[PDB]
Amino acid sequence: ADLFSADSAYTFVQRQVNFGPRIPGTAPHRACGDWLVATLRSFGAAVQEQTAEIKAHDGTMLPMRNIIASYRPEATGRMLLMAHWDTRPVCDQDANPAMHTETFDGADDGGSGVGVLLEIARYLGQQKDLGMGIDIVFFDTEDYGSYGDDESWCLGSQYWSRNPHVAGYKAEAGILLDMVGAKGATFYWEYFSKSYAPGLISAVWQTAAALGYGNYFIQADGGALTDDHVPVIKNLGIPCIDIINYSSKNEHGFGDHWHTQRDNMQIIDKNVLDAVGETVIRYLDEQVK
Numbered sequence: 001a002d003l004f005s006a007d008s009a010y011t012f013v014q015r016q017v018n019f020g021p022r023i024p025g026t027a028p029h030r031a032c033g034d035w036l037v038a039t040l041r042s043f044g045a046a047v048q049e050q051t052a053e054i055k056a057h058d059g060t061m062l063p064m065r066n067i068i069a070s071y072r073p074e075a076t077g078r079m080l081l082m083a084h085w086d087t088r089p090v091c092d093q094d095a096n097p098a099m100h101t102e103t104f105d106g107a108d109d110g111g112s113g114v115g116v117l118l119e120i121a122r123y124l125g126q127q128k129d130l131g132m133g134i135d136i137v138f139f140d141t142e143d144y145g146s147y148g149d150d151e152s153w154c155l156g157s158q159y160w161s162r163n164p165h166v167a168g169y170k171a172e173a174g175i176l177l178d179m180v181g182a183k184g185a186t187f188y189w190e191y192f193s194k195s196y197a198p199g200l201i202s203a204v205w206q207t208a209a210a211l212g213y214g215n216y217f218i219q220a221d222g223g224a225l226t227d228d229h230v231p232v233i234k235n236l237g238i239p240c241i242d243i244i245n246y247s248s249k250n251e252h253g254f255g256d257h258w259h260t261q262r263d264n265m266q267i268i269d270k271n272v273l274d275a276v277g278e279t280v281i282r283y284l285d286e287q288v289k
């Protein structure tokens with residue numbers, strides 16, 4: 001199956017990275033956001049932006065910019081796809097205490113999910129007579145928190161889930177992609193995903209298995225990860241899963257590149273992007289019925 005161009009997704013990641021770090025409040029962030037909006041529109045999506053001024057953990061006032069792209073916005077049966085598009089300002093997990101004040105590319109952490117969903121949006125824009133509405137949401141200000149302070153992360157998704165772009169917004173299911181591009185990635189059952197959306201997690205992991213991606217989508221418990229999907233679950237009641245590279249066997253749970261200078265384009269593996277994208281596209285295809 002090649003409904004999902006791995007080369008194209010890779011290129012989308014590289015473009016994001018070549019803007020420079022998409023750090024909230026900086027010029028590369030603004031330019032990359034403009035480009036994301038324009039690209040989604042070029043793929044036939046109706047795109048709107050949700051802006052707000054939000055207070056970070058350190059009092060910094062961030063210009064949150066969520067990006068919402070919709071196909072068939074009038075349809076009542078909807079599918080939701082999510083990723084965060086900001087970059088963490090500092091790679092304060094670098095295994096070199098000197099780099100805890102510098103910037104990293106966020107190729108996997110932010111770039112990968114956005115790239116996969118941009119390629120999926122291209123695919124969808126080529127479809128005529130979609131069977132369901134589809135919303136692609138790029139959350140801002142996901143990666144600006146402090147460790148141990150759970151509420152300081154996922155600010156864009158908190159805001160959107162508490163203030164959706166349409167009153168009573170509902171989708172049948174939600175899929176969040178987070179760090180879905182690194183070589184050797186392992187996608188285990190994230191706890192909140194399986195606890196609140198067991199049917200969706202089963203369907204997606206079995207879809208991946210059927211496609212030959214059981215080496216990436218492992219049918220075993222992973223971590224309990226408070227990601228952008230949890231506010232959506234809690235405040236909108238949408239069953240959401242999180243496809244995220246994480247393993248308790250990793251020193252940090254997340255890949256060793258996470259929040260280091262090594263989260264750059266050299267960590268990206270086209271085959272991982274392809275596994276995730278082919279899986280998600282096949283699931284969508286079998287849901288628009």
Ligand SMILES: Cc1cc2nc[nH]c2cc1C
Nearest residue numbers: 109143153178225226227
């Ligand atoms: C702490 C944390 C950091 C992240 N960075 C990208 N996704 C993330 C998810 C969590 C839960």
Ligand SMILES: [Mg+2]
Nearest residue numbers: 002004005006
């Ligand atoms: Mg493919």
Ligand SMILES: [Zn+2]
Nearest residue numbers: 088109143259
């Ligand atoms: Zn991060």
